[PDB]
Amino acid sequence: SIDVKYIGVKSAYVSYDVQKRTIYLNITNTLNITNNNYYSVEVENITAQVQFSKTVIGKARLNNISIIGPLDMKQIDYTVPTVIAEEMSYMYDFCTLISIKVHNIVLMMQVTVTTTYFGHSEQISQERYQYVDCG
Amino acid sequence: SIDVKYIGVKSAYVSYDVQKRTIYLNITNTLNITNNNYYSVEVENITAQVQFSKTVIGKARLNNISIIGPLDMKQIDYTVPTVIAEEMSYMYDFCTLISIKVHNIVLMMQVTVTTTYFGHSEQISQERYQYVDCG
Amino acid sequence: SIDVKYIGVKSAYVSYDVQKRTIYLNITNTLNITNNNYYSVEVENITAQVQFSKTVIGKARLNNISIIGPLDMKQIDYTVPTVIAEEMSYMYDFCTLISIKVHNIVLMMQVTVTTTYFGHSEQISQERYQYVDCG
Amino acid sequence: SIDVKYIGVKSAYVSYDVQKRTIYLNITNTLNITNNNYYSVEVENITAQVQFSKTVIGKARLNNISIIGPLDMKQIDYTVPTVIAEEMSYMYDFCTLISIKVHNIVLMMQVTVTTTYFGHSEQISQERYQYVDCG
């Protein structure tokens, strides 16, 4: 990666930005830029590359063979009861969240039993997150 | 990746942006830019590449063979009861969320039993997220 | 990827944007740009590439063989009862959400039992997300 | 990908945009642009490419063989009862959502038992999402 960046408000190369109650007067701004960029990125020079896989099974006796991959979930219970009994009563609820198994972002890449891989793999996340606001 | 960026409000190369209660007066802005960019990115020079797979099964006796891939979910229970009993009562609910198994973004890539792979793989997420707002 | 970007409000190369209660007066803006861009991206020079697969089964005896792929879901229960009993009572509900299994974006790519792959694979998500607003 | 971007409000190359209660007076804006762009993208120079698949089955005895692909769903139950009993009572509901299995965007690509693939594959999502608003 090159130049992965989180900027909260503002980006510039060059900035003369003015705000609020300003007297900006008799100004000379003179700017001579020479900004050149040369990226040579993820450049391969390969003569041979081989990804060979071979499985021989002879005069074998295989039995009861179980290959289970990743992220197996079995026998999982969420029990979240709510009861509200009221006699002769005043209830006031505001901004009340029951949240179960609540995801924002899920990135999965190369999630396997077997993997042969050759090259570049990349995950980038950039974010402002706010779960709850209440005034 | 090159130049992956999260900017909250504003981006410029060059900015003379003015705001609010300003007197901007007798100004000379002079700007000479030479900004050149040269990207050579993900450039392959390959003579040979081979992805060979071979499976031989001889005079074998295979039995009860189970290959289960990733993200298997089995026997999963969400029990979320709500009961509201009221006698002679005043209830006031505002901004009340029961959220079960609530996803925003799911990216899946190369999610497998077996994978042979040659090259570039990439996931990028950029976001403002806000789950709840209530005033 | 090159130049993947989330800008919250505004982008410019060059900006002289003015706002609100401004006196912008006797201004000389002079701008000489030379901005050139040269992309050489995902460029392949390959003489040979082979994706060979071979499966031989000899004088074999295969029995009870089960290959299950990814994201298998079995025996899953969502029990979300709501009961509201009221005698002699005043109920007031506002902005009440029961959300079960609520997705925004699902991207799936190369989700398999077996995969041979050669090249570039990519997922990009960019978004403003807001689940609930209520004033 | 090149130049994948989310801009919340406005984009320009060059901007002199003015707003609100402005006196914009005696202005000279002079702009000399030379902005050239050269894209060489996803360019293949391949002499040979082969995608060979071969399946031989000899004097074999295959029995009870089950290949199940991805995203199998079996025995899934959503039980979401609502009961509202009222005697001698005042109910007021506003902005009440029961949402079950509610999707926005689903992109699926190369979702398979077997796949041989050669080249570029891509998914891009860009969006403003708002589930609920109520004032």
Numbering used by the authors:
A (entry chain D), B (entry chain B), C (entry chain A), D (entry chain C): 120 to 254
Paper excerpt:
In addition to tau filaments, we also observed singlets and doublets of transmembrane protein 106B (TMEM106B) filaments (fold I) in the frontal cortex from cases 1 and 2, and TMEM106B singlets (fold I) in the spinal cord from case 2. Senile plaques have been described in around 60% of cases of Guam ALS/PDC and assembly of Aβ is believed to be part of the disease process. Alternatively, these changes may be age-related. This was probably also the reason for the presence of TMEM106B filaments in two cases from Guam and one case from the Kii peninsula.
